[PDB]
Design a binder for this molecule. Structure first.
Ligand SMILES: NC(=O)c1ccc[n+]([C@@H]2O[C@H](COP(=O)([O-])OP(=O)(O)OC[C@H]3O[C@@H](n4cnc5c(N)ncnc54)[C@H](OP(=O)(O)O)[C@@H]3O)[C@@H](O)[C@H]2O)c1
Ligand SMILES: NC(=O)c1ccc[n+]([C@@H]2O[C@H](COP(=O)([O-])OP(=O)(O)OC[C@H]3O[C@@H](n4cnc5c(N)ncnc54)[C@H](OP(=O)(O)O)[C@@H]3O)[C@@H](O)[C@H]2O)c1
Ligand SMILES: N[C@@H](Cc1ccc(O)cc1)C(=O)O
Ligand SMILES: N[C@@H](Cc1ccc(O)cc1)C(=O)O
Lengths: 249, 253
């Protein structure tokens, strides 16, 4: 049982909180917007003031804010007020950025665990089993607390993948970022089902619908803060152009 | 007497009203600028992200719970021709001449208008609404049954029921609640602290400060910008403080 504080209690913060509560951990939260009533509903304590959140009795701080805002959020936190050395976990969709920034900004005696649960409310509605949880033990000295946190995902059946933040971003730029870009592009075309949909087109409509559920902040953070994304955007754009020219001749 | 109620603006006060409406057995729908999907799931409310879908739902009464400052933009963005049926619009803004004038100008003629201000909220009616004041003005009512069923929501909670014009409301609110918030905001800027030797009077001021600082600055701003009688009351406050101050100087001398 862990005392887990969520920083950024939005869509994915709430998603993680439901399962950690179910396992019996003690959850608290803080966020830019006021989630007092939703935390009341869920049965957890919300701290309108980040300073009171950080002086509380807390084993793990999970950074669930948007990629775009992480630097501002960490910058606004009075981290010297931490009672104890504390494990910091990030769940951002890109990994080199939070690794670099937490190593730079956190107090040195705070541990760092960089993760990406490769799933969320769209793909893992009825549980985490067989979805991938990527993690990088960036700066761990309390292996007990870190293992307790990682076990949250192991006991839910996740496929557990240790890899560096760099290898994550290289792979994510080719897969997740391309998938979102295609979903977003179909969203601007506003593709719609017809009476003669093929199965392939049905999957694309569904892919469009699920990708459009993520914020534009999230999508844009995949591009801005993954140094490998720009070339994958080029690869996609160049390939489409080459396909077009085989048709145009 | 159980209603299909849609709430526009599911923020701090919209949620406050919904809690008691759910307790009474009403069926609630909500829409808002921000996404309250999860919280509405918890409370059993049907949440529409898009106001156009909101307006085609099965709604008896639409309750406008957006900030004073945003009412004009929110109503303006509503495709009001999407309305399935003539519908009662209720306003719960803390000032009243403004929504009354705007809804009479903007709403479809066939839609009824009840202009209200519950003189209480999360800070003062935390443990129930009993013997708090609920003000209302029947601006344009033709279906008396639905209007009466809505007003019943507050009467059954033990509210003090005050029928009064929107003008008379703003006249009284400029002299009272605006002054109260101004004093609380002034004490908040002074950041007054408790002391070894607090008197009871000072204790109530500290408490008043804390309660007044819990409302949004948008709200406090709306009390002044959209009440044509607030400006004179802010002058009367400064004028009174300076009158007291000068008598101290004369007493000093
Ligand atoms: N399935 C998923 O959605 C998923 C999966 C894996 C990882 N992630 C990652 O989890 C994190 C949150 O994802 P999300 O889906 O909830 O959507 P998101 O739009 O990326 O992030 C929303 C959260 O970021 C906060 N936020 C945004 N801008 C802020 C700013 N200037 N200042 C302070 N706080 C700000 C928001 O606070 P408020 O809510 O209080 O306004 C909210 O809590 C992201 O880093 C995402 O990359 C998401
Ligand atoms: N005790 C009270 O607080 C109390 C008592 C009586 C009457 N009232 C009145 O009830 C109404 C709500 O008050 P409140 O306490 O909840 O705080 P408020 O700050 O006055 O209003 C908050 C609501 O206004 C919405 N909003 C603000 N700016 C907006 C904009 N440009 N566009 C669209 N929506 C906007 C917000 O939408 P989102 O939440 O989706 O962001 C939120 O729902 C006010 O008119 C107030 O005068 C309040
Ligand atoms: N939100 C998607 C997955 C996802 C996870 C993280 C991301 O960064 C992006 C997408 C889902 O429900 O599975
Ligand atoms: N929000 C405070 C004060 C307040 C009352 C009425 C209002 O219209 C606005 C603010 C309360 O709980 O009472």
């Amino acid at each position: 049982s862990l005392k887990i504080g969520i920083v950024g209690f939005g869509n994915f913060g709430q998603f993680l909180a439901k399962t950690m509560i179910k396992q019996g951990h003690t959850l608290t939260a803080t966020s830019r917007s006021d989630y007092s009533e939703l935390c009341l509903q869920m049965g957890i304590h919300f701290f309108r003031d980040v300073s009171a959140f950080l002086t509380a009795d807390i084993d793990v701080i999970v950074l669930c804010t948007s990629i775009l805002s992480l630097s501002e959020v960490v910058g606004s936190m009075p981290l010297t007020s931490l009672k104890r050395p504390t494990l910091f976990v990030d769940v951002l969709s890109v990994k080199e950025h939070p690794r670099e920034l937490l190593l730079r900004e956190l107090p040195e005696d705070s541990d760092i665990l960089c993760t990406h649960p490769m799933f969320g409310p769209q793909t893992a509605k009825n549980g985490w089993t067989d979805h991938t949880f990527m993690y990088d033990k960036v700066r761990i000295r309390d292996e007990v607390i870190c293992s307790n946190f990682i076990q949250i995902f192991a006991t839910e059946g996740c496929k557990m993948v240790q890899m560096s933040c760099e290898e994550h971003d290289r792979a994510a730029a080719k897969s997740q970022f391309i998938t979102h870009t295609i979903g977003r592009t179909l969203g601007e075309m506003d593709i719609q089902s017809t009476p003669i949909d093929t199965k392939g087109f049905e999957t694309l409509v569904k892919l469009k619908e699920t990708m459009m559920r993520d914020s534009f902040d999230l999508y844009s953070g995949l591009f801005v803060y993954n140094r490998f994304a720009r070339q994958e955007l080029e690869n996609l754009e160049h390939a489409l152009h080459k396909v077009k020219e085989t048709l145009m001749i």
